[PDB]
Amino acid sequence: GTFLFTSESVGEGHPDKICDQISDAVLDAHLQQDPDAKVACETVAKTGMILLAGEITSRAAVDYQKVVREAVKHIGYDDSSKGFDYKTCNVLVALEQQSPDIAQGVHLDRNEEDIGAGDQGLMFGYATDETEECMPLTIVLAHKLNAKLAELRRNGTLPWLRPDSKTQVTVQYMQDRGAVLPIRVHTIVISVQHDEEVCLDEMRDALKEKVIKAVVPAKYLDEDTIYHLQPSGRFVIGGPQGDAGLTGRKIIVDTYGGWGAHGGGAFSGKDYTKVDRSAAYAARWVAKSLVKGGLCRRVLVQVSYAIGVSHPLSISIFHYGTSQKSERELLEIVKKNFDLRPGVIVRDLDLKKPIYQRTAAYGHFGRDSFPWEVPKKLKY
Amino acid sequence: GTFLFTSESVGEGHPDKICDQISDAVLDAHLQQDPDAKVACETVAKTGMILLAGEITSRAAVDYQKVVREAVKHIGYDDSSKGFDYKTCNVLVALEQQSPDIAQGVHLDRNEEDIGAGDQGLMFGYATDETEECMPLTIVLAHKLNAKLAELRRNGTLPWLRPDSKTQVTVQYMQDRGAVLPIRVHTIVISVQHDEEVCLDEMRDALKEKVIKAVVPAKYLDEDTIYHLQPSGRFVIGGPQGDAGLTGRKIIVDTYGGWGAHGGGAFSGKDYTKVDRSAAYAARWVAKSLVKGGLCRRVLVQVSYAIGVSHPLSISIFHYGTSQKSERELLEIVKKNFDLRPGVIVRDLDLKKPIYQRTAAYGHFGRDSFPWEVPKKLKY
Ligand SMILES: C[S@@+](CC[C@H](N)C(=O)[O-])C[C@H]1O[C@@H](n2cnc3c(N)ncnc32)[C@H](O)[C@@H]1O
Numbered sequence: 001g002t003f004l005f006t007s008e009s010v011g012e013g014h015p016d017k018i019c020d021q022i023s024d025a026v027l028d029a030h031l032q033q034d035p036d037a038k039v040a041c042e043t044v045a046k047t048g049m050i051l052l053a054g055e056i057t058s059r060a061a062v063d064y065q066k067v068v069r070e071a072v073k074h075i076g077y078d079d080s081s082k083g084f085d086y087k088t089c090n091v092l093v094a095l096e097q098q099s100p101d102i103a104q105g106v107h108l109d110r111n112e113e114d115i116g117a118g119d120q121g122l123m124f125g126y127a128t129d130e131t132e133e134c135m136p137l138t139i140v141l142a143h144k145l146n147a148k149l150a151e152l153r154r155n156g157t158l159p160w161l162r163p164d165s166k167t168q169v170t171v172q173y174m175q176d177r178g179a180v181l182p183i184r185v186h187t188i189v190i191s192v193q194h195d196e197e198v199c200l201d202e203m204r205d206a207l208k209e210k211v212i213k214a215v216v217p218a219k220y221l222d223e224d225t226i227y228h229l230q231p232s233g234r235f236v237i238g239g240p241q242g243d244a245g246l247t248g249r250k251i252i253v254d255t256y257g258g259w260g261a262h263g264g265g266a267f268s269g270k271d272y273t274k275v276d277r278s279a280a281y282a283a284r285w286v287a288k289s290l291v292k293g294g295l296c297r298r299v300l301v302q303v304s305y306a307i308g309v310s311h312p313l314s315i316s317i318f319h320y321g322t323s324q325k326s327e328r329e330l331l332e333i334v335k336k337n338f339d340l341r342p343g344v345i346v347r348d349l350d351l352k353k354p355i356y357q358r359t360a361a362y363g364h365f366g367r368d369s370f371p372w373e374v375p376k377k378l379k380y
Numbered sequence: 381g382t383f384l385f386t387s388e389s390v391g392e393g394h395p396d397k398i399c400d401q402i403s404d405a406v407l408d409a410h411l412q413q414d415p416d417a418k419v420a421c422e423t424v425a426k427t428g429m430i431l432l433a434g435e436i437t438s439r440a441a442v443d444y445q446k447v448v449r450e451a452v453k454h455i456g457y458d459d460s461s462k463g464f465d466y467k468t469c470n471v472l473v474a475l476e477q478q479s480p481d482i483a484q485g486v487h488l489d490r491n492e493e494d495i496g497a498g499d500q501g502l503m504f505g506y507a508t509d510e511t512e513e514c515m516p517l518t519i520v521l522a523h524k525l526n527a528k529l530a531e532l533r534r535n536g537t538l539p540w541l542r543p544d545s546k547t548q549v550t551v552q553y554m555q556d557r558g559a560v561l562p563i564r565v566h567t568i569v570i571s572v573q574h575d576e577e578v579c580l581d582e583m584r585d586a587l588k589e590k591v592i593k594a595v596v597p598a599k600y601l602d603e604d605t606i607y608h609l610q611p612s613g614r615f616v617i618g619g620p621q622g623d624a625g626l627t628g629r630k631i632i633v634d635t636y637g638g639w640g641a642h643g644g645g646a647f648s649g650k651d652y653t654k655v656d657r658s659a660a661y662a663a664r665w666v667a668k669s670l671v672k673g674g675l676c677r678r679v680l681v682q683v684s685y686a687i688g689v690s691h692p693l694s695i696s697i698f699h700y701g702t703s704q705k706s707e708r709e710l711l712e713i714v715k716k717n718f719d720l721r722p723g724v725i726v727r728d729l730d731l732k733k734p735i736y737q738r739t740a741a742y743g744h745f746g747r748d749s750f751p752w753e754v755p756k757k758l759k760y
């Protein structure tokens with residue numbers, strides 16, 4: 001019954017993640033002034049350039065130059081020696097109003113609770129009892145390794161670190177009637193941008209001793225664990241200079257690390273009317289409520305929408321064999337306890353609040369007791 | 381045992397799909413002259429703009445203006461009345477060479493068979509016996525509905541159609557020991573950009589009679605099937621003008637429609653050394669070989685890599701309960717029959733051939749007998 005599973009994560013300075021954070025900094029800036037802002041902000045990053053492209057209709061007065069540059073500063077790209085500098089990069093803006101055709105079909109002259117979905121699409125929520133936070137251990141560990149790198153960079157412990165990083169964790173699991181049980185860490189990859197002075201052996205030693213050992217419990221590591229630390233051998237060029245980034249290109253890092261399922265929609269840069277985000281957060285909330293409610297050890301929920309239509313077109317459940325209840329029974333419990341219209345999700349999950357930039361690195365789920373992470377007490 | 385499942389697809393003029401097609405037109409243009417071109421071409425589209433951003437190291441001499449404009453022309457955006465025109469749009473280029481740090485760690489001075497993976501990451505392949513092409517019926521039907529729209533647009537049957545479209549199909553299934561059996565179509569959504577003259581009732585009637593009935597077998601449609609046709613009510617503004625597009629923002633449309641799993645990587649604009657594409661194609665090839673070989677009715681395969689390392693770090697199998705063989709036995713059969721090093725996949729799947737633009741709409745899988753769609757005869 002043993003098997004392997006792998007997930008990855010990326011750091012705050014990974015170029016795709018820079019774009020997600022900037023998109024969400026823009027969304028938050030709008031929501032701070034106009035809780036009803038309609039935002040669809042894509043970000044593109046390449047050497048010396050942040051471009052904003054998309055559609056925003058809002059009563060806010062937002063200084064895009066300042067918002068973008070402050071987000072880049074926070075990430076840590078503050079000098080040309082690091083390959084990118086918030087003070088001196090180009091910020092280009094190609095933002096128009098929301099299409100009036102979309103606006104009239106989705107939200108104009110609609111009661112909020114009865115607002116239409118902002119697009120068609122499908123979304124999934126997942127939860128697993130293998131960790132207290134109801135997330136896969138593979139992706140939890142991968143995120144924590146990137147967070148540790150940023151911590152040691154920011155506290156000056158490892159001053160040769162730069163913001164761009166990737167990690168990948170392969171766990172060996174056992175299974176019991178569909179639930180999964182972590183046994184050990186089989187393989188770890190860490191790649192992180194670094195300065196010109198540090199040598200490879202110094203980096204590899206620090207990554208094992210100060211990063212991996214500070215994150216992964218020793219009980220999971222043994223003489224057979226495989227370590228791929230700085231496997232490319234050199235990573236001085238990094239950030240947008242090494243690889244163009246775009247918003248919504250880390251959707252699996254943002255969610256479940258390959259476990260569960262994904263409908264394809266990106267989260268960052270979108271207000272609540274874009275069900276790609278709000279309905280995925282609500283589906284996570286449902287899945288976590290089913291697991292924390294003791295109805296199943298792990299579960300997947302699908303929901304779907306049509307643009308302009310408030311109620312979901314479909315809802316589906318897969319319990320992996322981890323419930324005594326059938327999937328039909330669990331679906332009835334979901335329908336009795338949740339209303340997945342976007343105009344109701346916004347109220348339940350407080351989705352006009354400007355907390356989105358906080359979600360845009362280290363995963364949207366399993367952290368910080370956001371509203372979608374607080375289970376609903378189920379009645380049945 | 382009945383349940384619903386939903387998948388979507390988009391047309392050739394959907395702005396994200398425009399970007400995937402342009403990225404792959406650029407890749408093909410390079411490969412026509414330099415089979416060993418290193419290409420990582422992202423495309424961004426917004427009103428009046430195509431921007432290319434990324435990294436290319438190649439001996440080819442490519443005229444980006446011509447390649448981009450010809451791709452847009454093929455899609456059908458050829459007049460300002462349609463919201464976008466290949467003749468007069470802005471084409472901006474922000475392309476640099478591949479990072480020398482990546483090049484030295486991946487492929488420089490390496491035997492081709494022993495080339496390293498171009499990045500870390502995880503990838504999945506999936507196959508299901510529910511259709512001859514081994515794809516989910518939900519996504520097959522969703523793709524065919526977009527193809528039908530483009531066909532009726534191009535043949536002048538429905539001259540009010542424009543290139544930007546989305547479709548979504550919810551199928552009601554039964555199941556038998558993990559295999560899935562389509563019963564009926566529960567809901568169909570179609571949204572398509574249109575001219576200023578056609579009325580809503582004319583469009584809805586044509587979408588039902590000339591599009592849906594021409595694609596979906598009557599046996600799946602009944603008096604209870606729900607139709608959401610032009611549900612926003614008006615879709616005159618479309619293409620990049622209505623919504624900014626980016627390469628790699630339709631990764632679920634490109635693959636399995638929510639079924640199976642996804643590792644997060646985008647396909648378009650990347651040469652074979654980027655395992656996001658090559659290893660996902662090889663994983664599809666493995667999954668389809670297991671199903672067509674009669675070892676299982678449906679199956680999911682995971683593979684993962686570290687940048688600079690040729691052999692996969694992990695391989696995993698999930699057979700949904702549809703094989704008499706254990707997943708451990710199926711994994712041994714896979715390891716005996718396949719070599720998923722990128723430098724071997726390139727040879728098996730002929731991945732230097734410039735056929736990539738053909739993959740960039742209507743899904744990468746289940747069509748045209750590409751090499752990854754031709755099962756391998758298994759020995760065990
Ligand atoms: C390897 S790059 C993708 C391929 C790249 N666009 C190319 O031109 O080959 C993807 C990510 O890997 C990381 N990366 C960049 N340079 C790297 C290096 N020298 N070694 C390891 N990882 C690197 C960065 O996080 C980057 O965003």
Ligand SMILES: C[S@@+](CC[C@H](N)C(=O)[O-])C[C@H]1O[C@@H](n2cnc3c(N)ncnc32)[C@H](O)[C@@H]1O
Binds near residue numbers: 055056613624
């Ligand atoms: C609805 S838009 C995404 C949200 C949009 N960025 C906004 O500002 O609200 C996503 C896709 O839906 C389609 N679309 C655009 N305008 C539409 C309309 N008026 N009705 C229906 N679908 C539309 C296009 O395929 C577009 O790429």
Ligand SMILES: CN(C)c1nc(=O)n(-c2ccccc2)c2cc(Cl)ccc12
Binds near residue numbers: 004261680698
């Ligand atoms: C318990 N177990 C053996 C697995 N559980 C799973 O949830 N999936 C999985 C993941 C995503 C989508 C669908 C299934 C697996 C997938 C693979 Cl490739 C291997 C093992 C598993």
Ligand SMILES: CN(C)c1nc(=O)n(-c2ccccc2)c2cc(Cl)ccc12
Binds near residue numbers: 559640
């Ligand atoms: C047979 N059956 C009931 C389903 N089969 C599946 O493959 N998945 C599924 C899809 C992606 C990832 C993991 C599982 C389902 C998922 C849902 Cl939400 C509902 C039903 C199913």
